[PDB]
Ligand binder design. Structure first.
Ligand SMILES: CCCCCCC/C=C\CCCCCC(=O)OC[C@@H](O)CO
Ligand SMILES: CCCCCCC/C=C\CCCCCC(=O)OC[C@@H](O)CO
Ligand SMILES: CCCCCCC/C=C\CCCCCC(=O)OC[C@@H](O)CO
Ligand SMILES: CCCCCCC/C=C\CCCCCC(=O)OC[C@@H](O)CO
Ligand SMILES: CCCCCCC/C=C\CCCCCC(=O)OC[C@@H](O)CO
Ligand SMILES: CCCCCCC/C=C\CCCCCC(=O)OC[C@@H](O)CO
Ligand SMILES: CCCCCCC/C=C\CCCCCC(=O)OC[C@@H](O)CO
Ligand SMILES: CCCCCCC/C=C\CCCCCC(=O)OC[C@@H](O)CO
Ligand SMILES: CCCCCCC/C=C\CCCCCC(=O)OC[C@@H](O)CO
Ligand SMILES: CCCCCCC/C=C\CCCCCC(=O)OC[C@@H](O)CO
Ligand SMILES: CCCCCCC/C=C\CCCCCC(=O)OC[C@@H](O)CO
Ligand SMILES: CCCCCCC/C=C\CCCCCC(=O)OC[C@@H](O)CO
Ligand SMILES: CCCCCCC/C=C\CCCCCC(=O)OC[C@@H](O)CO
Ligand SMILES: CCCCCCC/C=C\CCCCCC(=O)OC[C@@H](O)CO
Ligand SMILES: CCCCCCC/C=C\CCCCCC(=O)OC[C@@H](O)CO
Ligand SMILES: CCCCCCC/C=C\CCCCCC(=O)OC[C@@H](O)CO
Ligand SMILES: CCCCCCC/C=C\CCCCCC(=O)OC[C@@H](O)CO
Ligand SMILES: CCCCCCC/C=C\CCCCCC(=O)OC[C@@H](O)CO
Ligand SMILES: CCCCCCC/C=C\CCCCCC(=O)OC[C@@H](O)CO
Ligand SMILES: CCCCCCC/C=C\CCCCCC(=O)OC[C@@H](O)CO
Ligand SMILES: CCCCCCC/C=C\CCCCCC(=O)OC[C@@H](O)CO
Ligand SMILES: N[C@@H](Cc1ccccc1)C(=O)O
Length: 448
């Protein structure tokens, strides 16, 4: 009987749905930094390029922090399938905002819409993939691997299409393509879902009991009130610049796992929770480096590379391209390698060392040739080749979204240090540091 690569046919609907959402997200991000550079260049947007880079990082951080509660809201309040649909709608609207004939004034509205939308859609589209399978089913992990391939499929073709469109017909048109991408995702999702998805997930699977409603409301109200109080105080004391607000979001993002871990810490349980701290840190630092590809490596692509024969935003395709290219091998690897299939911590250790190697490699062209000229595109190609080796090793949903969010929050401060005069030191020191405490994670690995 017909399947989608051996899997239930529903996977095809969810495959394409996420491929097109990821298309809209990554197509937009492959030109967003350049768009801000452009807005700065015309005097419309009053920030430094450093701050612009910082915005890209905290933006990514908020997008995944939002997903850490998206699952809850679907499971307990609105249902997984409506979460994805209305999430998709909010994302489309976010891209439409940028297609409108506005400038810097439209940036915030776009960002908020996409942050909220992605929080609803991403964890729940992934959750729905699981719903295709009985828990007894063995295909389940193959199904997600296919799903992830779809994620990177969209991530791969989006910069090629949106970037080319930007150079040809301008930014607004290019952003409109992203919106259209999400629109296409919603169409397939809506009509394909009705044919192939369980109507069980039109509603929340664990709806709030009567006595649970008021305490939840109290809880979120106190969080919103406290957050609002801090912003009030910040303006009183004069800490009300954009970087001040970015610093606030950074702190909140990092305070969450810290606050979390610190007071969940019988004696044995205590330690095994403490056992996952270094692995959480490993994921955070790895995703820090991985997410810098769209910021620092994007900057390097635009400023330090001779690629005058194609849109520089196309370098953003190398990351998911390598994912797709590496997948057949690692499929072969994990089967064929049966004994000594290594510690989940070790996969984290090595994965971080590779990330560290990817940056160390980028320290070389400036050390050898200087930083005022331009170097071969192959440095970036080699750099992404290394960091994606790590990502192959690295692959609750919330925690996963959380490690990423903290990584990008860290980036929001780090990437402000990058410039052509810091380049070599920047790459070398953050590169070495990552290798070193990926090695430190080897000393500790089995001590765990
Ligand atoms: C106009 C404002 C738009 C609001 C959209 C921005 C939302 C960004 C982040 C959502 C904050 C939720 C806090 C996350 C949280 O509670 O912790 C995650 C939970 O998994 C703890 O492990
Ligand atoms: C229609 C309103 C859209 C803007 C807000 C979207 C709703 C976002 C958050 C609602 C708060 C729900 C509480 C989140 C929460 O407590 O998460 C608990 C955490 O354990 C998640 O696993
Ligand atoms: C300026 C804001 C524009 C917003 C316009 C968006 C209107 C979109 C759809 C109109 C109603 C269709 C309802 C479809 C729906 O509820 O989907 C439910 C979802 O669970 C599908 O699986
Ligand atoms: C407890 C609630 C957490 C709130 C999370 C914060 C979500 C709100 C905004 C996030 C936007 C990130 C920064 C976007 C930005 O600075 O762009 C605006 C600027 O370009 C306009 O001049
Ligand atoms: C990069 C140019 C586009 C060509 C991509 C190949 C055809 C595109 C989509 C159909 C294949 C999607 C399923 C991918 C797949 O079979 O997964 C392989 C491996 O991860 C096992 O799950
Ligand atoms: C169905 C809703 C999602 C699809 C969005 C539909 C977008 C369709 C057309 C958007 C046109 C955007 C380009 C308009 C524009 O400002 O171009 C700038 C031009 O004047 C300079 O080259
Ligand atoms: C400049 C563009 C116009 C701005 C508003 C565009 C609104 C476009 C689309 C609204 C949501 C489309 C959702 C697609 C879908 O499958 O919905 C089906 C549902 O309505 C059937 O009841
Ligand atoms: C799109 C909806 C997101 C809701 C944002 C969260 C609002 C803040 C606190 C939760 C208040 C309870 C709202 C959920 C609710 O109405 O529960 C009713 C139902 O689950 C049981 O009666
Ligand atoms: C729903 C959660 C609380 C949001 C209600 C109060 C909203 C006020 C501020 C939201 C914090 C976002 C920080 C980004 C921001 O405000 O941009 C800074 C801009 O004014 C630069 O001057
Ligand atoms: C008021 C104390 C409540 C608990 C602490 C919560 C976080 C406290 C301060 C965070 C404010 C944002 C980061 C600090 C800040 O604004 O930097 C100032 C500087 O950027 C202005 O140029
Ligand atoms: C008693 C609580 C456990 C021990 C306290 C741990 C501290 C808790 C939260 C601190 C947030 C991390 C600091 C955020 C950060 O590194 O950003 C620095 C920068 O944004 C400040 O301008
Ligand atoms: C997997 C193999 C790829 C290895 C690539 C990384 C190679 C190892 C170290 C490269 C470090 C280059 C440091 C050059 C340097 O920092 O000196 C430059 C300085 O003197 C001028 O600013
Ligand atoms: C799986 C481990 C990855 C193995 C990677 C091995 C790569 C070995 C060395 C890479 C260092 C960069 C070489 C420096 C270089 O070629 O510069 C010379 C070049 O500019 C041509 O004149
Ligand atoms: C696994 C082998 C990969 C080779 C990595 C070795 C690369 C080490 C350093 C980068 C090449 C030297 C760059 C030129 C250099 O640093 O000379 C010092 C110069 O900057 C002082 O003016
Ligand atoms: C996105 C992948 C990057 C493609 C890797 C290609 C790297 C190899 C060579 C790049 C530059 C040399 C070939 C292009 C070139 O400069 O030809 C000369 C031309 O610019 C004269 O106008
Ligand atoms: C499966 C392979 C993954 C690991 C590969 C590591 C790649 C290491 C280095 C690649 C880039 C360094 C070589 C750059 C290069 O070709 O020199 C530039 C030369 O064209 C002068 O313009
Ligand atoms: C058949 C096994 C495949 C595994 C290949 C592993 C080889 C690791 C890295 C290959 C990258 C090539 C290193 C680039 C280099 O050495 O610089 C080239 C330089 O000579 C150009 O002038
Ligand atoms: C429990 C997991 C914790 C996650 C560990 C990651 C947080 C550790 C350190 C974050 C400190 C970042 C401070 C960077 C900084 O302030 O310097 C950049 C500054 O110059 C920006 O202008
Ligand atoms: C004993 C364990 C050591 C393992 C670390 C292996 C790391 C491999 C290569 C590291 C190359 C170091 C690069 C030198 C460096 O960063 O200094 C130059 C830098 O300051 C440029 O401004
Ligand atoms: C355990 C995670 C640690 C992550 C945070 C580490 C960052 C610490 C300090 C950053 C600011 C001062 C360090 C400056 C630096 O490392 O690079 C040199 C500078 O020229 C360019 O970055
Ligand atoms: C400048 C050249 C430095 C070369 C560094 C060589 C590789 C880096 C460190 C040696 C490997 C770790 C050595 C200690 C060790 O094996 O730890 C004990 C065991 O528990 C391993 O987990
Ligand atoms: N490249 C990953 C980034 C990511 C990791 C973890 C959570 C969310 C996003 C993706 O698009 O899925």
């Amino acid at each position: 009987g017909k399947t989608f690569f051996g899997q239930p046919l529903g996977l095809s609907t969810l495959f394409m749905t996420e491929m097109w959402e990821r298309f809209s997200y990554y197509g937009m991000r492959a030109i967003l930094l350049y768009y801000m550079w452009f807005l700065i260049s015309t005097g419309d947007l009053h920030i430094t390029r450093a701050t612009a880079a910082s915005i890209m990082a905290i933006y990514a951080s908020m997008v995944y922090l939002s997903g850490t509660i998206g699952g809850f809201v679907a499971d307990r309040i609105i249902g997984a399938r409506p979460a994805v649909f209305w999430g998709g709608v909010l994302i489309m609207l976010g891209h439409i905002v940028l297609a409108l004939p506005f400038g810097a004034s439209a940036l915030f509205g776009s960002i908020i819409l996409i942050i909220i939308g992605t929080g609803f859609l991403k964890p729940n589209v992934s959750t729905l993939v699981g719903t295709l399978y009985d828990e007894h089913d063995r295909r389940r992990d193959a199904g997600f691997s296919i799903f992830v391939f779809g994620i990177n499929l969209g991530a791969f073709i989006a910069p090629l299409i949106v970037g080319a469109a930007q150079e040809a017909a301008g930014y607004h048109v290019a952003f409109s393509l992203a919106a259209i991408g999400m629109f296409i995702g919603l169409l397939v999702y809506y009509f394909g879902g009705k044919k192939t998805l369980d109507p069980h997930y039109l509603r929340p699977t664990d709806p709030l009991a009567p006595e649970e409603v008021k305490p939840l409301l109290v809880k979120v109200s106190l969080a919103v009130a406290g957050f609002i109080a801090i912003i009030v105080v910040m303006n009183l004391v004069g800490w009300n610049s954009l970087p001040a607000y970015i610093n606030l979001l950074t702190i909140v993002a990092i305070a969450i796992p810290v606050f979390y871990f610190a007071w969940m810490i019988t004696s044995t349980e205590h330690l095994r929770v403490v056992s996952y701290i270094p692995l959480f840190i490993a994921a955070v630092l790895f995703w820090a480096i991985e997410e810098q590809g769209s910021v620092v490596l994007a900057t390097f692509a635009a400023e330090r590379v001779d690629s005058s024969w194609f849109p520089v935003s196309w370098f953003q395709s190398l990351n998911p391209l390598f994912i797709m290219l590496y997948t057949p091998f690692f499929a072969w690897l994990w089967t064929a390698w049966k004994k000594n299939q290594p510690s989940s911590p070790t996969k984290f250790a090595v994965g971080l060392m590779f990330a560290g190697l990817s940056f160390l490699l980028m320290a070389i062209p400036g050390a050898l040739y200087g930083t005022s000229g331009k170097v071969s595109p192959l440095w970036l190609v080699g750099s992404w080749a290394l960091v994606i080796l790590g990502e192959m090793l690295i692959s609750m949903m919330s925690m996963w979204f959380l490690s990423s969010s903290v990584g990008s929050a860290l980036n929001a401060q780090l990437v402000t240090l990058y410039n052509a005069k810091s380049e070599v030191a920047y790459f070398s020191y953050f590169g070495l540091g990552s290798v070193v405490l990926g090695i430190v994670l080897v000393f500790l690995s089995k001590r765990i």
